[PDB]
C-alpha cells in the first residue's frame, strides 16, 4: 500500500515539473538543445523583443542557459539579418573567490555579445539599513533574510537592464532545483523564460558539455544530494528516507511553484 | 459573427480572472468580506505563519486589503488566544504629497497592530548608479525603468520584513488591474496572497466602505477608465473601442498573469 502510493506521488511530481526522461542517446541530447534554443527564439519573437538578459554566476546552470541564449541570438542574427538581437551577460560580483574565478571562466566560455557588471552591494546595504525589522534578529535568521534580499535585488538589476534594452530575463530553474524549492521566491525564481525547465541536474551538465563548456565548469559543485534528487525525478531507485524528504520539501514549497494565492 | 466572438472572449477573460459577479445585495457584500477574511486566515494556518505584511500607499486597494488583514488577525487572536498573530503595515514614503497625506489617513483608518517605515530611496539610487544600461537612456524610458525598480524594491522590502517576522506578503491585485496588466511584473504583482483577486474596481471601493473607510479614501483617485474596465469585466455595455483596447492589452500582458515560460 505504502509503496504504490509513494510511486504515484513521485509520478505526479515528475509530471508537474515536466521532468525530461533520461537521455538515451546523443539524438536526445541534441534534440533538447535544438528545442530549447528554438524556445528562446520563440519567446523573443512572440514578445516582439530582441535582447536577452542573464546573470552569470559561475555555476553550471547559468553557464548552460547562457550558452543556449548566445547560440539563440547568433542564429537569429544570421537568419533575420537583424543585428539588434543581442545577449547581455550580467556579472553580479559577490565575495566567494572560487565563484568569481568561475564566473570569469564562465564568461570566457559563453563569449556573450555584451557583458555588464552590476555591483548590488550598495543597494543591498542601503535597503538593509532602512529595515527596522532587521534590528535584533538572530544571526542565522538575519543571514537568510539578507541572502534573500541579495537574490531579489539581483532580479531587480536584471529586470532593469531588460527594461532599458527591450529584453527578456532568462532564469536558470530546472527540475532538480524546482522540486526542492531551492531558489528565492521572486528572486532567482523570477524570470520571463526558464529554458532549463524540466531538466535533472545531470541533464543540465550533459547539455553544458555538449554546448562546449570546459570540464571544470561542467562538474563545478535539505540533507539530500543532487544525485538522489535526480533519481527521484526519473523514478529510479533511491533511499526511502531521501524520497520522503524530497516529497515533504516539495509539499512545503508548493507556494513557490504557483501563482499568488487567491480566494 | 464579430459580436458573438467578442462576447465569448469577454466571458473567457472574466472566467480566467475569476471576476466576482456584481453585488446584488448587502448579503453579497458581507459574504465577500467574510470569505476574504477567512481566506487570509487559511493562508496563515496552512503556512504555519502568524504575521501579515502589506505596504500602505494611500490608495483604496491597499486600504481595503489592509482592513481585511487587520480584521483577520484580530479575529485570529480572539479565537486562538495566540498573541503572535500580527499585521504589519509598511509605510513606503515617496514624494507625492497628496499620496502621503492619504497614506497617513489610510493608516489612521486601518489602525494596524504595527507600522514600519521603509525609505527605499537610498536602495533605488544605489542600484541605479550601478546600472550602465541606464546611461544615455531616453528620459521617458528611463523614468519607466526607474519606476519599475522602485516597485520591485518595495516588494523586496516587504519580503524582507515578512522573512524576519515569519509572515506572508499581501498583494493588492484585483480584476480591474489584472485585466490590463496594471502592475509591475515581480514588483507589486509579487505577493504570497492576493485577497482582492477577482474584484472589479467599484467592488474594491464597496468593500472599503463596508469595512469603515472614510468616504474621501473610498473614492480616492491605456486610454480607458476603470468604469469601462469594470463594465467589460461584468459583461455590461461599453464602447466597442474601449472593449477592443481592453482585449488587446489583456493579450499583450498575458505573460504577467502566468508562471515563467517553459519549453
Ligand atoms: N530561510 C531559511 O530559514 C532557510 C532554511 C533552509 C534553506 N533555505 C534556502 O534558502 C533559499 C530561499 O528559500 P527561503 O525559504 O529562505 O525563502 P523564500 O523567500 O524563497 O520563501 C519563503 C517565503 O515564502 C512565503 N511563504 C512561506 N510559506 C508560504 C506558504 N505556505 N504560502 C505562501 N507563501 C509562503 C513567505 O514570504 C516566506 O518568507 C532556498 O534555497 C532554501 O532551500 C532557507
Ligand atoms: N514601460 C512602459 O513603457 C509603459 C508604458 C505604458 C504603461 N506602463 C505601465 O507601467 C507599469 C509596469 O508595466 P511595464 O510594461 O512598465 O513593466 P513590467 O516589468 O511589469 O513588464 C514588462 C517586462 O515583462 C517582460 N516581458 C514583456 N513582454 C513579455 C512577453 N511577451 N513574454 C515574457 N516576458 C515579457 C520584460 O522583462 C519586460 O521588461 C504598468 O502599470 C503599465 O501599465 C509602462
Binding site membership of A148 for ligand 1 (Cβ less than 6 Å): yes
Number of domains forming the structure of chain A = 1
Q: Does A160 sit within 8 Å of B131, measured CB to CB?
A: yes
Taking CA–CA distances from A127, the nearest residue in chain B reads B123
Residue closest to B106 by CA, chosen among B56, B154, B71, B37: B56
How far, in Å, CA of B201 to CA of B180, rounded? 12
- Residue B172's nearest CA partner among B247, B263, B68, B97 is B68
If you measure from the C-alpha of residue A184 to the centroid of ligand 1, how many angstroms do you get, rounded to a whole number? 7
- Can you give the CATH number for the domain in which B246 is found? 3.40.50.620
Q: Chain A residues with CB inside 8 Å of B18's CB?
A: 262
Full residue range of the structural domain in which residue A60 is found: 1-263
Q: Which residue of B has its CA nearest to A19?
A: B263
B6 contacts: CB under 8 Å, gap ≥ 6: B243, B247
| Start-to-end CA span in chain A (Å) | 35
B76 neighbors B39 (Cβ within 8 angstroms) = no
- In whole angstroms, give the CA distance from residue A144 to residue A141: 5
Interacting residues of B63 by C-beta distance below 8 A, sequence separation 6+: B56, B106, B109, B110, B208, B213, B217
- Give the Cα separation of B27 and A38 in Å (integer): 53
- Per-residue three-class SS string for chain B: CHHHHHHHHHHHHHHHCCCCCCCCCHHHHHHHHHHHHHHHHHHHHHHCCCEEEEEECCCHHHHHHHHHHHHHHHHHHHHHCCCCCEEEEEECCCCCHHHHHHHHHHHHHHCCCEEEECCCHHHHHHHHCCCHHHCCCCHHHHHHHHHHHHHHHHHHHHHHHHHHHCEEEECCCCHHHHHHCCCCCCCCCCCCECCCCCCCHHHHHHHHHHCCCCHHHHCCCCCCCHHHHHHHHCCCCCCHHHHHHHHHHHHHCHHHHCCCECC
B172 vs B27: CA distance, rounded Å = 23
Alpha carbon nearest to ligand 2 atom 37, residue: A168
Q: Which positions in chain A touch B260 (Cβ < 8 Å)?
A: 171, 173, 190-194, 197
Q: Is A61 a catalytic residue?
A: yes
Task: Name the nearest CA neighbour of A152 among A121, A115, A189, A181.
Answer: A189
Is B25 annotated to bind ligand? no
Cβ of A130 and B157 within 8 Å?
yes
- In 3D space, the residue among B81, B66, B78 whose CA is nearest the CA of residue B36 turns out to be B66
Q: Which of B168, B169, B171, B194 to mutate to test the pocket of ligand 1 (most atoms within 8 A of CB)?
A: B168
The answer to whether B59 is annotated as binding is: yes
Coil, helix or strand for A129? Answer: coil
Q: How far is the CA of B252 from the centre of ligand 2 (A)?
A: 9
Using CA atoms in the order B67, B72, B75, B81, what is the torsion angle rounded to 10 degrees?
-130
CA distance A169 to A51: 9
- Check whether A102 is labelled as a binding-site residue: no
How many C-beta neighbours within 10 Å does residue B6 have?
14
Cα distance between residue A145 and residue B92, in whole Å: 19
Residues in CB range of B19: below 8 A, 6 or more apart: B175, B198, B200, B233, B234
Name the structure determination technique. Answer: X-ray
Say which of A113, A177, A188, A228 is annotated catalytic.
Answer: A177
Task: Please tell me the residue having the least CA distance from ligand 1 atom 16.
Answer: A144
State yes or no: is A143 an active-site residue.
Answer: no
Beta strand residue intervals within chain A, DSSP E:
51-56, 86-91, 114-117, 167-169
Q: B43: which strand partners?
A: none
φ, ψ for residue B89, nearest 5 deg: -85, 135
- Check: CB of residue A259 under 8 Å from CB of residue B259: yes
**Resolution reached, in Å?**
1.5
Amino acid at each position: 500500500h505504502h509503496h504504490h502510493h509513494m510511486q504515484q506521488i513521485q509520478r505526479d511530481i515528475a509530471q508537474a515539473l515536466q521532468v525530461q526522461p533520461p537521455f538515451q542517446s546523443e539524438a536526445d541530447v541534441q534534440a533538447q538543445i535544438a528545442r530549447r534554443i528554438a524556445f528562446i527564439q520563440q519567446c523573443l519573437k512572440d514578445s516582439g523583443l530582441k535582447t536577452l538578459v542573464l546573470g552569470i554566476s559561475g555555476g553550471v546552470d547559468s553557464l548552460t542557459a547562457g550558452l543556449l541564449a548566445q547560440r539563440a541570438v547568433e542564429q537569429l542574427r544570421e537568419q533575420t539579418g537583424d543585428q539588434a538581437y543581442r545577449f547581455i551577460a550580467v556579472r553580479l560580483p559577490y565575495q566567494v573567490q572560487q565563484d568569481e574565478a568561475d564566473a570569469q571562466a564562465s564568461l570566457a566560455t559563453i563569449r556573450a555579445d555584451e557583458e555588464q557588471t552590476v555591483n548590488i552591494g550598495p543597494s543591498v546595504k542601503a535597503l538593509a539599513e532602512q529595515l527596522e525589522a532587521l534590528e535584533g534578529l538572530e544571526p542565522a535568521k538575519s543571514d537568510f533574510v539578507i541572502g534573500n534580499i541579495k537574490a531579489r535585488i539581483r532580479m531587480v538589476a536584471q529586470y532593469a537592464i531588460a527594461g532599458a534594452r527591450g529584453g527578456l530575463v532568462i532564469g536558470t530553474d530546472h527540475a532538480a532545483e524546482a522540486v526542492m524549492g531551492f531558489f528565492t521566491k521572486f528572486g532567482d525564481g523570477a524570470c520571463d523564460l526558464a529554458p532549463l525547465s524540466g531538466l535533472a541536474k545531470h541533464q543540465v551538465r550533459a547539455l553544458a558539455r555538449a554546448l562546449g563548456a570546459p570540464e571544470n565548469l561542467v562538474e563545478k559543485i535539505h540533507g539530500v544530494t543532487y544525485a538522489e534528487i535526480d533519481a527521484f525525478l526519473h523514478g529510479q531507485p533511491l533511499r526511502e528516507e531521501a524520497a520522503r524528504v524530497i516529497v515533504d520539501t516539495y509539499h512545503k514549497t508548493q507556494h513557490k511553484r504557483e501563482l499568488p494565492k487567491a480566494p
